[PDB]
Amino acid sequence: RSYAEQLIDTLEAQGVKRIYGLVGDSLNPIVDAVRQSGIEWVHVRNEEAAAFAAGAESLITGELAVCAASCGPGNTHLIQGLYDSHRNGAKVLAIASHIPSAQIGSTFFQETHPEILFKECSGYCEMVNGGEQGERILHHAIQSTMAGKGVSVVVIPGDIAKEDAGDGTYSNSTISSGTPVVFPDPTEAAALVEAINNAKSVTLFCGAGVKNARAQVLELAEKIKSPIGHALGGKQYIQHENPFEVGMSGLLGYGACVDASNEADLLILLGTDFPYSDFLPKDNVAQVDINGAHIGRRTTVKYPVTGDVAATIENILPHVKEKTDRSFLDRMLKAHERKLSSVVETYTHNVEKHVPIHPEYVASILNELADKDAVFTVDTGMCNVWHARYIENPEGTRDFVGSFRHGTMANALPHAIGAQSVDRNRQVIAMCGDGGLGMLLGELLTVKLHKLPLKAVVFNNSEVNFADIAAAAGIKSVRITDPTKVREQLADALAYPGPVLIDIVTDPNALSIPPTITWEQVMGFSKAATRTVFGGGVGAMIDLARSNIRNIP
Amino acid sequence: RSYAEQLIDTLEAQGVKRIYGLVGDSLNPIVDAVRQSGIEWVHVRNEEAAAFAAGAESLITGELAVCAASCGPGNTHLIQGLYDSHRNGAKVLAIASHIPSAQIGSTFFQETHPEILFKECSGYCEMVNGGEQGERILHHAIQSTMAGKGVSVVVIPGDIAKEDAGDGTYSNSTISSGTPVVFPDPTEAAALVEAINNAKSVTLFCGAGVKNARAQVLELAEKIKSPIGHALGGKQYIQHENPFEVGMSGLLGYGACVDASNEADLLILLGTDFPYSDFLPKDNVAQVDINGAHIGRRTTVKYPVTGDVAATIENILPHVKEKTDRSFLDRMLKAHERKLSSVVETYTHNVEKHVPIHPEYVASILNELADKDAVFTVDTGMCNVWHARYIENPEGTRDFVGSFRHGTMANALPHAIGAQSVDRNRQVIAMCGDGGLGMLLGELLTVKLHKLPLKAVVFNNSEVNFADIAAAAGIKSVRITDPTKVREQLADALAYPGPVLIDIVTDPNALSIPPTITWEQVMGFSKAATRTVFGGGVGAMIDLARSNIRNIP
Amino acid sequence: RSYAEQLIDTLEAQGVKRIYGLVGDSLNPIVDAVRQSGIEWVHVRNEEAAAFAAGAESLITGELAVCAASCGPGNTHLIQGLYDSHRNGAKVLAIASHIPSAQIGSTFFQETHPEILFKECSGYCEMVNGGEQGERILHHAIQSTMAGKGVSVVVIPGDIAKEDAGDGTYSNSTISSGTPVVFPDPTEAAALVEAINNAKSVTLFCGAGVKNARAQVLELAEKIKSPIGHALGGKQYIQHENPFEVGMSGLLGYGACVDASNEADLLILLGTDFPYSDFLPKDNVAQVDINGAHIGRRTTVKYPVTGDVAATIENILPHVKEKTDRSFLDRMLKAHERKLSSVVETYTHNVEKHVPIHPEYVASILNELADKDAVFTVDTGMCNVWHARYIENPEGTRDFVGSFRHGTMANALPHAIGAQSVDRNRQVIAMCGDGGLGMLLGELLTVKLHKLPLKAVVFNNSEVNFADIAAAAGIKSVRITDPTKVREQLADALAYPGPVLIDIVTDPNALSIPPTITWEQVMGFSKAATRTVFGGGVGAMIDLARSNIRNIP
Numbered sequence A, B, C: 001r002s003y004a005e006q007l008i009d010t011l012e013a014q015g016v017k018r019i020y021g022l023v024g025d026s027l028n029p030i031v032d033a034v035r036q037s038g039i040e041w042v043h044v045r046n047e048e049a050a051a052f053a054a055g056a057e058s059l060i061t062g063e064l065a066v067c068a069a070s071c072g073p074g075n076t077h078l079i080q081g082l083y084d085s086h087r088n089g090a091k092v093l094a095i096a097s098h099i100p101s102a103q104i105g106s107t108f109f110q111e112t113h114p115e116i117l118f119k120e121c122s123g124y125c126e127m128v129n130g131g132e133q134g135e136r137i138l139h140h141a142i143q144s145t146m147a148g149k150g151v152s153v154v155v156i157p158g159d160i161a162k163e164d165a166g167d168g169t170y171s172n173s174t175i176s177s178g179t180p181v182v183f184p185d186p187t188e189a190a191a192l193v194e195a196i197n198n199a200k201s202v203t204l205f206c207g208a209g210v211k212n213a214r215a216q217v218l219e220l221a222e223k224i225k226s227p228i229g230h231a232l233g234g235k236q237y238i239q240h241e242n243p244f245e246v247g248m249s250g251l252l253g254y255g256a257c258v259d260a261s262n263e264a265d266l267l268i269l270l271g272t273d274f275p276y277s278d279f280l281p282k283d284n285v286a287q288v289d290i291n292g293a294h295i296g297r298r299t300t301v302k303y304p305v306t307g308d309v310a311a312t313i314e315n316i317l318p319h320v321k322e323k324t325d326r327s328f329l330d331r332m333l334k335a336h337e338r339k340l341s342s343v344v345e346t347y348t349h350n351v352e353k354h355v356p357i358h359p360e361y362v363a364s365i366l367n368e369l370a371d372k373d374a375v376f377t378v379d380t381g382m383c384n385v386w387h388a389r390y391i392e393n394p395e396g397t398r399d400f401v402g403s404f405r406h407g408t409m410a411n412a413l414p415h416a417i418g419a420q421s422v423d424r425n426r427q428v429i430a431m432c433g434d435g436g437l438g439m440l441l442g443e444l445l446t447v448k449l450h451k452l453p454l455k456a457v458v459f460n461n462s463e464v465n466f467a468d469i470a471a472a473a474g475i476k477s478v479r480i481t482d483p484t485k486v487r488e489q490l491a492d493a494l495a496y497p498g499p500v501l502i503d504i505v506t507d508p509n510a511l512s513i514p515p516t517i518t519w520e521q522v523m524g525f526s527k528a529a530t531r532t533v534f535g536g537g538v539g540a541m542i543d544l545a546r547s548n549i550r551n552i553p
Ligand SMILES: Cc1cc2nc3c(=O)[nH]c(=O)nc-3n(C[C@H](O)[C@H](O)[C@H](O)COP(=O)(O)OP(=O)(O)OC[C@H]3O[C@@H](n4cnc5c(N)ncnc54)[C@H](O)[C@@H]3O)c2cc1C
Pocket: A206, A207, A208, A209, A210, A230, A231, A232, A233, A234, A248, A249, A250, A251, A252, A253, A270, A271, A272, A273, A274, A275, A288, A289, A290, A291, A294, A307, A308, A309, A310, A380, A381, A384, A403, A404, A405, A407, B109
């Protein structure tokens, strides 16, 4: 058998179910092996979508996901989605098909040196030079991404896919995909205990690193009476049913999070790399991170701790003294609810009758009507504001995929294609901005071909009729222009048993920016301390804020 | 004044009229300086289009063209178009806006290291670290691309655009954009004279390097009675009104070019880097190239000559003896016309009544109806076959832009946006494949915004209604399904004074591939000598073939 | 036969006589093929020396020179010498032996990715992946460096050297190594003519680009009565027998060059990339360079010309008007001789009796005693000052090799090993600094092994006895401590028919630095205009200065 056959057999034995990619001639031997296997080829019409779809699938499943591209220009289109996947921590293998080995170094038709292009967006990237070495580096690529070291790329000269397979020595191996339990160094954990016991008031600020530490964070918060704020990456895990909830920091922020973080005697950063330093205090900060290289990237950290959040809290809890004074927690919960109530009153008074349709009204209804376990994908831009302030996660059963770190546009539909491919019976909603729809046609043609029943909600601030474009491409569509019809039309679109594009004509003057917000602040290089956020209201998060006030002892 | 103001003033003083790009927040100071200048910002809705549009503009004008992108993901979208522009020899400066200098090295939001990504697709790529150094490297970037050394990239941390301008020392300089006259080394030129005088029969094979050498190539051919064949890059310059015409080599080839090249006593490669070595002889070859590093890249070369084609022929002509025997030239001209007549008879007999519409019928009519000075842009894929075999260049007044070397898909509309922006009164036709239309929407929205009257001819082998999609995006469209209506409907679409999308439903089974053509041959790594080309007919080129037979003495 | 045999046969057929390198196990197949060939392996004891020796050989012969290194750490030692060779324009091929192809991508023992390390110090660098492709990229590497495009590197996985040779298609080719004749663009040449005719006074400032243009530069100078100054790279070609000589600019400078350059109505930079902009005027400058990308790198250039210096002067001379007024030339020649006489009087009055020995006294005697056709190699540091101010080139028959652009230390003995290997009957003098002798032992052991009769002149400012070290390593040595014995002892050492190390105890307080020279000026980032040079005298150059005054009409 050939190396193309061995590559596909190896992926199949490891549980890979799909490969995303646009087929080109250099991939033909690999596509032929996939056709004879149990793996499904997912044909993306835009080559740039393949790596976002694989990234989104891996984020949903926790398992390896795979994308592929043809030689030269083909694998150049992997770069954006691989930066996004790599920064998001998605476990992706990219099969970068390459020119024939005989043409390397001759400035051949389509020739590139793909190893140079993926150096920053991967943990492992090597070229195959034969079947035996190709089997070996395929193992190393999978083992590197499954051990959490980043995206992996295997560059395969087209002709070598047809050469003989290796002998099986590396494909026979079991991949380590376990989660080690990382306890902190006792000296660092003792310094954190002392910092907490010496502080009269503590605030916890959580990011994506608290994903598997909800119970420990909440147990710690109840013991020391600490308000809990979050970065955007931690919103989905820690905001829901949180008795200590004080919102989010940054320009898309809300509530008393910036106040609680800067007024507490001690701030504890838990599993976060929140980059907007002008919102963070410097006086007295602790930071717990599983990657020690991340500690102190964003502000002065006096109590650094390398370790897992859950294992670190479990280790310090018997030595942390109970704080009976919750004056600070009560003050912050009250200020939090007043801040949310104030932005609702200032910006969304009688928003249900606003014409053209207010996007915040759409987001509020969308939060109510979407399924309790829906996946939301979020296009970079204004949709990040609507997700942050209106899309909630009751009981933690929704999933959220976006380009929160790499910040690239037009990611929602490619992410949704991967997320929807995991389970066709699960609802997937893609929040799309009209500006991020220049590549819409290829995304719709992929959705139509694979019958992926995702719901593309377009915040149309153009005038372009996206409902007519979707209908011409063979996709069911609806156009919403009257605010009194949003609930009815959205409920009917979300109930459609198939792919739908929902074209909602929204008000282009929605983004409210206070006169004090500068270009330096927007760009993230303003030094002066700030508590200023973009204008606009908030949604259903106010219900938890209000129950937390009623439950104050 | 600021460095952003100085950058725009410098480009404006050098004759730059447009900057192509998608505006993002990191570019705001530069966009503000453009607004107050005589330069027009051309807003591309797909960021990937900017570098193709600049590349196409530079190929048409011969002058500097400029594209720009916002930080991180933004300048990652420049890569495809910059590889294409760099390989095509287009003189492009890319303004790669970058994250704030204070965040470099902190894994900030959107952070990339753009210097690593452009190393292979540029001749110069440096980062600005202040206003004074920024003025200097802007000069060096422009001087490098104007001297023919490749694409140039200037990476500008967003905050530095607002810092003070340099003192003018480098912006005050005159750029050398001249064309030196490169005569060959007399020893190399003497060896070429001897090779020609010792050969009884000679064939010339021309590429893009004969652009300014038509008269010299034809004068040499008449003196030694040599058939003249071409690579695809040389078709536009040497095929028209050529009394020695014997067609093109490679799988998209036609006529007796492969026979004449391999049967002549001496083959002279003139200004070509044709990469399909299995079509080239090895026994006795000369090669003239202005870049000595390119000589002998593709086959055995015994008579290498570094120099300009026109200056080299002028230098050797007084020493080359007149060949009175034209038996070989006559045999090749006769075989050439029989080969063209044979493929017309085999593949396009009664093609005017073929249903669904034959793409070769569309291409033939398009060649007749398009203006004598039209620009054609060619989408990579089947449109390369139709351009090569049907779109002619009478009197050399048409221009052709495609991704002939980098071979990336979806280039036709981005190339056409740049070409059309040069002169709105000049016809621009974009030959689009239905597979290369996943990014169509953003291209149409740019064309609509700037009122660019290009004609997008879509070879629709899908069923998708692209005419309805174009009409929904606010673009005039027509749908052609009946072959007897192609001439009338195409003539009316080409006459429309504005942008039009022409959706032509064509036969998806057009590509004829002989059973002997292997995947190795398609991929370009088959070693065995070949004369086999893809099936299909040829167009109006047969008229010149037939006049050349009538003019045989 | 094997690819190792084919590589050596190919180099041998192209006239390669030596390969410099330290043999390691990964090179064994290549070393075995060299042993059975006419090529000599030159064993360098310090692997870092190999690339400097090849660079020096190529500078002396004008032909390809070759170095080799073993895998991993071995080819890492090529980098310094390859930056030096690449910047000096030496035509070098480096054979970078690499780990076995089966281990690539496995973090094997000694594994590196050598392609990344040579990107800036080469014009071509590719990896061999088989015998056929290896033959092809060997051709491309040689053709790139012989066409003047920079150093070339061929990376060869150790095991592939034992695989079968390619079929000969590329090794059968003739390499283009000719010198094209580059005439300027007539528009640029016309602007240069106008600038010269409108100026009342002109100064020419020449660099290494005037190597083959002495007669044209001197003919132009006589016609327009222009003083001729030089950068250090042009000293060896234009200073000797020059009736217009006005010295050198920069901190190591001398004479009226800075004055003549800044006081003339027009400055013409001819074949120079002199980097110390604070010594250059900005008001009215022309620049002629064969590489257009270099034009205007260093100051404002209003009259840029891309072209060869000799061809450009030949083209403009019939249109340049004769200037009969030589008031400026006479004033500059007089000021030049007064400046040289003044530094001799200020710094070297009675230097023949100075104790410890003055290095300027050593340099003056060395200039007199060395052969008329000697090669001088110059260690970076104080030896650059002594070469610049004391080592002359009567009739142009001496050669000079140094690290003038890359500026790396300890280059003199590795450069001298390559230069001496070209012709054992030609005198080679290496000017060594005591600080640049930490790697002396390996250099002496190579010189002893190959019986290279070079003369290592050590300016010993330590106390270390280098004569005793050389004697212990088996090399003839002499120690000079008395200034009255320098002439006699140096004459006897230079006459020794074999390698000699001459240990001269010199005064460590020789470097005179005026109180106005700042660290910014030493580092090359001071903006203010300057005419200040380091203290110290000059040598035999004063004889030409004085004859030029006597010959003033
Ligand atoms: C248009 C736009 C606007 C934005 N505006 C904002 C804004 O106003 N506010 C905002 O908050 N964000 C904003 N973001 C996103 C922002 O740039 C950051 O990506 C985000 O704040 C980071 O969230 P995080 O810290 O949860 O995740 P990450 O940056 O991924 O950090 C997670 C950290 O947890 C660590 N970790 C992982 N697992 C564990 C574990 N088991 N134990 C311990 N540590 C662990 C990781 O090593 C890492 O350091 C914006 C994004 C976009 C696209």
